[PDB]
């Protein structure tokens, strides 16, 4: 697990995301889709977007970015005691959206990239390491639920 000092790094950085949830959310989803266009295919809602300019122009995509970061923020704020918040998410992503664990790894990389881009002064290697650990813990617990339900990977 994360040490107290590492959770402090994560939660203090997260406060910076909360100062502009829509901007960070938009940037993270665009970075995911550009870096890994195969992830687009999983969203019937977005698969029509073919270019980066189209992604930037979509109000619906910006709305979903808020949904994603609001859910992730609720989880991080539980400092690992996130069973009630994580369960519904693991269920829907395994059984309904059918999202492989690898794509959760890809979105974790996009989050780190955007935090670095937006906060070059604030988000040094120690915070980056701590954020990586927090997202790993998130993935580990989702993966366990996937395995339970017979999806895993
Ligand atoms: C940071 C990790 C992620 C969080 C916190 C997250 C959160 C959510 C939330 C809260 C919803 C709406 C409720 C629901 O259906 O459960 C949702 C919908 C969805 N998510 Fe995720 N998600 C994450 C990663 C991903 C990834 C990597 C993909 C695909 C590559 C994905 C695919 C979807 C799809 C297809 C929907 C349904 C969208 C719609 O048609 O309305 N999610 N996500
Ligand atoms: Xe996001
Ligand atoms: Xe998820
Ligand atoms: Xe994640
Ligand atoms: Xe972010
Ligand atoms: Xe987490
Ligand atoms: Zn890829
Ligand atoms: Zn707008």
From Swiss-Prot:
Residue positions, PTM Phosphothreonine:
67
Q: Which residues carry this modification: Phosphoserine?
A: 3
Give compartment(s): Cytoplasm, Sarcoplasm
Q: What is its EC number?
A: 1.7.-.-, 1.11.1.-
> Could you give a single Gene Ontology term from the biological process aspect?
removal of superoxide radicals
Q: What's an example of a GO molecular-function annotation for this chain? A: oxygen carrier activity
Provide the reaction this enzyme catalyses: Fe(III)-heme b-[protein] + nitric oxide + H2O = Fe(II)-heme b-[protein] + nitrite + 2 H(+); H2O2 + AH2 = A + 2 H2O
Asked if the keyword Heme belongs to this entry, the reply reads yes
Annotated binding of O2, by residue: 64
Which Pfam families does this UniProt record tie to the protein? Globin
Q: How is this protein annotated for GO cellular component?
A: extracellular exosome; sarcoplasm
Is NAD among the key words of this record?
A: no
Domain Globin span(s) in chain numbering: 1-147
Specify which residues bind heme b according to the UniProt entry for this protein.
93
Q: Where is it mostly found?
A: cytoplasm
Q: Which residues bind nitrite?
A: 64
- Output the InterPro entries linked to this UniProt entry: Globin, Globin-like_sf, Myoglobin
Record's keyword terms, sorted: Cytoplasm, Heme, Iron, Metal-binding, Muscle protein, Oxidoreductase, Oxygen transport, Phosphoprotein, Transport
Describe the family membership recorded for this protein in Swiss-Prot or TrEMBL.
Answer: Belongs to the globin family.
Subunit architecture: Monomeric.
Q: What does this protein do?
A: Monomeric heme protein which primary function is to store oxygen and facilitate its diffusion within muscle tissues. Reversibly binds oxygen through a pentacoordinated heme iron and enables its timely and efficient release as needed during periods of heightened demand. Depending on the oxidative conditions of tissues and cells, and in addition to its ability to bind oxygen, it also has a nitrite reductase activity whereby it regulates the production of bioactive nitric oxide.
* Protein known as: Myoglobin
Q: Its encoding gene is what?
A: MB
